[PDB]
Design an enzyme around this catalytic site. Sequence first.
Site, short mmCIF file in Angstrom:
data_model
loop_
_atom_site.label_atom_id
_atom_site.label_comp_id
_atom_site.label_asym_id
_atom_site.label_seq_id
_atom_site.Cartn_x
_atom_site.Cartn_y
_atom_site.Cartn_z
N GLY A 1 0.85 0.67 2.33
CA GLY A 1 -0.28 1.03 3.15
C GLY A 1 -0.05 0.55 4.56
N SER B 1 -10.67 1.67 0.78
CA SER B 1 -12.10 1.89 0.62
C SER B 1 -12.80 1.82 1.98
CB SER B 1 -12.69 0.85 -0.34
OG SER B 1 -12.43 -0.47 0.12
N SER C 1 5.30 1.60 -2.13
CA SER C 1 3.94 2.17 -2.11
C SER C 1 3.22 1.37 -1.04
CB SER C 1 3.25 2.07 -3.47
OG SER C 1 1.89 2.50 -3.38
N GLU D 1 -0.77 -2.37 -10.77
CA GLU D 1 -0.62 -3.22 -9.59
C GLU D 1 -1.16 -4.63 -9.87
OE1 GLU D 1 -2.50 -1.92 -5.96
OE2 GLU D 1 -1.73 -3.63 -4.81
N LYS E 1 3.60 -1.50 -9.42
CA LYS E 1 3.42 -1.80 -7.99
C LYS E 1 3.22 -3.31 -7.86
CE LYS E 1 0.61 -0.72 -3.94
NZ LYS E 1 -0.47 0.10 -3.32
#
EC number: 4.1.2.13
Lengths: 350, 350, 350, 350
Positions: D303, D36, D301, D189, D231
Amino acid sequence: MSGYGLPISQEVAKELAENARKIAAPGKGILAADESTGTIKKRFDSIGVENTEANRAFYRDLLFSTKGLGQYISGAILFEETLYQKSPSGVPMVDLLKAEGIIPGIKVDKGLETLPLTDDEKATMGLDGLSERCKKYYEAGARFAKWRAVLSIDPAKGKPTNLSITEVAHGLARYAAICQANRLVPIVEPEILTDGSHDITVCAEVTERVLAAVFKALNDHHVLLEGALLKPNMVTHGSDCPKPASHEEIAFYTVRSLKRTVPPALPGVMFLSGGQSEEDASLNLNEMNKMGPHPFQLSFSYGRALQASCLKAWKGVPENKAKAQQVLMERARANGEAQLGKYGGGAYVY
Amino acid sequence: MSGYGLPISQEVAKELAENARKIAAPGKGILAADESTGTIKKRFDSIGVENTEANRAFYRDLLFSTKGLGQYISGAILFEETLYQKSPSGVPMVDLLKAEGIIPGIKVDKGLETLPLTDDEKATMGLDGLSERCKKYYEAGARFAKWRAVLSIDPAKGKPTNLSITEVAHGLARYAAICQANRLVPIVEPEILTDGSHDITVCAEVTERVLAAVFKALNDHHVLLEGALLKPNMVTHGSDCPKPASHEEIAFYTVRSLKRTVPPALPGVMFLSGGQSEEDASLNLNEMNKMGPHPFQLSFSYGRALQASCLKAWKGVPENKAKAQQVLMERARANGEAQLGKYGGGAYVY
Amino acid sequence: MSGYGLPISQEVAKELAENARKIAAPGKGILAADESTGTIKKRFDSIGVENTEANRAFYRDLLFSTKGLGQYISGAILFEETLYQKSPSGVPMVDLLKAEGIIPGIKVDKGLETLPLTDDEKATMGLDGLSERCKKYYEAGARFAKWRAVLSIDPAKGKPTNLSITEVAHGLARYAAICQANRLVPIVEPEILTDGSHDITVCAEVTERVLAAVFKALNDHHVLLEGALLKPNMVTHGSDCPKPASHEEIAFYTVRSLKRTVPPALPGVMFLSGGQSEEDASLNLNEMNKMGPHPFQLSFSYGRALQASCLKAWKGVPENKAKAQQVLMERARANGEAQLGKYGGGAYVY
Amino acid sequence: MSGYGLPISQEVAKELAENARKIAAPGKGILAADESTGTIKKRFDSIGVENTEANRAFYRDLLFSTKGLGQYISGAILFEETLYQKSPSGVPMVDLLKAEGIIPGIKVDKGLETLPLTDDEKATMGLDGLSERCKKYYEAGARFAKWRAVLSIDPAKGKPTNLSITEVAHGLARYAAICQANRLVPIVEPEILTDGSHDITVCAEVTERVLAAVFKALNDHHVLLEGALLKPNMVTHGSDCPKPASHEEIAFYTVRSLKRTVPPALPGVMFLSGGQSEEDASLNLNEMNKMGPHPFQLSFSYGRALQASCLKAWKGVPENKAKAQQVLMERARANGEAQLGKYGGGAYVY
């Protein structure tokens, strides 16, 4: 212990409990005037009135400016529009309520949405931004809130399903705790619809199961019962039944279902009228309060049962305003007297 | 609906509800005389008496033949041995109770067993054969039953754990439904032990959580609250605290915990004394009933708090029998008066 | 953390996991010979044999002394009588099993009892004294246990009800944890009966819901999946259906229901045959293992499907013993080959 | 049966299951680029870059236009801004993904909010309007969604509390069912944060309890596991521990926690990196896939663990773009190889 709810603020708790008892005051109940735009359209279509903002403002002013209404009405549930609205004469709606000592309340749910892979069973939406909304509404003068969940009875389809009941209870408990964190008394409304041809005993069984689940969830979420109210359906036959149950039966099974599930720290049970006639709504409540004294106040939070004849008397005609306020007073008095078990009528099973 | 509990027999339900209200009669409570062989040994060792069958028969006869005991005692919980026992003079114990109009009750659990992979958290055993036992006990004159579950408070260990609470509630609900199917009123006893140095507010939080779970499970298992009784612990400081809470505090938090969790269809809450002194047990109950009227009867189901001085007066000496019955009467009167909030003493927080 | 299950003994856990994998060995499965006195009577009545102790001993010896049976049978479930029984020739039954390297197991439940106020829904009884029984049985040579729970499908009655599923799961989880505390691998048997005319898709939905509840409860009670086995029903049409589902359909929906609910730490799923013919039981298992490799072993724990023709060949006649052992071997081989997906037959939907 | 979930559309289910398996493709994983505005600020502040719209567009284009990225990346999670954004050169971000055959996904939660009367335990918000958002996002090219819930471990405070776990599971299950009703594969998640000094065995216990609750709730809400992804956090020591657990330990306890709770119909477990270094994230995943074959795909997954060095190489300097894409490719290859257990390193307990 470690792992339990943190202690609620004593100052917040005292305010919630004081306001909840004020709303559940003997001889008084709630005027439910929180019809959304689409619901008030239905109400207005039934008397052929254009659902404009000016007509809504005129009608809500007609209700709230009724002189002496506060003798029988402790609180008024508003739609958001009305909370921030002025009467046609320029007076804020909340100021009309304050002049009569009626506590403003605010509907905070965002309506219903189908639960996926159910037979159009409904979740109530509205938790997102709710805490921030509650703060704004408190500032604007609201001191209690309302959130409506809906359940259906259908034995052939197994309704209400486990998922329906679980969702209803979860949403109501989250909403109630958020309200209390923001100094609003939550009205917990798990409405079991009358749709269908089931017997009153089926309504009683379902109501018990639903309320047991709701109150367990309220406890799980650290909701203060002393500062909350319940708005359930009365226990009745389904609406497709050709014979409506007697007022004695409805009162018996309704009180029984509550006493089997509702802890007595809750100060008030404020019934929805749920399609009943104005007179049935009053007589049914009256019959319950002939069975008193009760461990909580049994009273009303009526929309249709307080306004039906008022609407029919107003007809959208401004000149019919006084007549309309008179009929509203007649029904408010009837239901205030019914709260005390002193309504005179108008025009054990385990 | 399909999927709900079948309707309970009205005839059975009426008997259960009538007997539950008789047990929870104003000004009266329960004498808990159901010490198993090993527990009565402890009681007897404290006064140096050999735990023989004849001594047990002598002592239980001393209790139950006390003239006028039925003025203050509505029911007496028996161990199985005693239910089928005769006094030293040859009179069946149940006939002594009947002569005073005291209702016989029977302990039906089979004691405690550690839950695997807990820190010696306890399950209550006894469901196997319970239904058949209840039938035999009813025939022998019992009209209510008792099942004791035990929970510990230990914040550092997270006690009571979720598994403890779930097991306690499940066992109590199964037991209660089986009793009612066999025309016995179930006393539901979820005892939270005082062990530890926790504050009264911790006891209040844990008691609330436990009772919320118990009553949800009772509902799930179709237990008739109108024909059941609750036997909880009072809400107190832990027993390692150097300062016992005031009687006012204990009464406040105990009543609050009950009103937050117990539906008012339940006729009676009959407190265990749980290690309190005879005088504290009476004063604490008295203080609660100065806060009345309540939605259910608040009374007593005392073992130690009715017998401690009786035992000390008897000393195993037959000649001390009358003196011992006199002190039993003194404590029975004290606690009957405390039920009414009229005991004169002897020798809001959210 | 504080509040979680204490760590299981590594030495106990290793034994349980090693024995569970031995029972779920490739190409092998379980002979379920644990018919109680009343159930073996039914089996014996179907071939007109007097249910005497000597006949039971003769028949169980016929089964367990079958030479080479251990090629296909990893474990044999016994009734308590048989665990402590000697063959007509004087050899302990457990010694016959050991000679073939078959692991002895023991049925430990005490049968079924109606849940009060259900439409004859069943609780499984037997937790009282179970821990002590498990110790004795381990001493006698048992290394795994079995506990049978039963659920019914009846859409019109809402069966299986929430109470049925909750009770089944609770009893199975308590039993499984007690077994593991006593070094016995628990077979968890939640049998959904075929009674009724429901479709295979209804059986699939109910099986999923039941298994999801069972495995959540196993987790809640700290059951070690690595040292446990599941004995479920295959997913099939109801027994009143005129058309039995294809073997392909049964295999598809059975594997799907398991993969949707059973965590893969569980080493083995050992199907009950539940009234299927000997050939259907083998072909259905074979079809599932043509869909492999699977995350757990899919195998058998068959009673009727391993013994039906054996019984019919024996006829209570001693002289038919060799013939009877031959047919038992034929079915054991069939089902061992079916475990590998290599049985040649004998005489995606979301 | 009556009372169960309606059948999911076979056409919708097939699309969900096909796309879930495409995302969980061997040798590939997910690039989590859905920071975000406020989270990307943190990322950008760490390298001193102004968090403008143009810089965000430049950076996301740098990521998604990396030539050959689709060899190792099956899907990319986007923030809403990016889903509707064009690169500095004018190309829609989704078109960059399509050119590499990378499936677009969309973060759909609305962030975190404290649960009332918890010690800042968090609910995830976003269900209101979610169904309508999912429809728009599908139209825009998204085929999977992501919703992040957060739990803390704190033994002294009893975290995660029952209310935290119940809320996390409820929100994830509602979200997942809504996604599937709108043809989006839900990534579930439930992140257990590493905050604290607890041991890896505590993380394992908490992870098991949380996942058991999540998957029970997914089943209750009729979520199709065949068309969903998980996740979770890897199982590790807390971040205040001076000694990070070995890669062998992390892999063992992570795989164990999954196999004890996750039904194998789920196609893929795509780990979050949760503060681990780029190299640890790859080595830990690699170690798990040396323990294969597994009942579901174990992949990534990531980031931070895919972008940290990319960001540090870019430095906000346009000229460093190729270098930055090269390092992204290096980490994508590392983690794709780790999915297969073939990563060579770079610069039983019950």
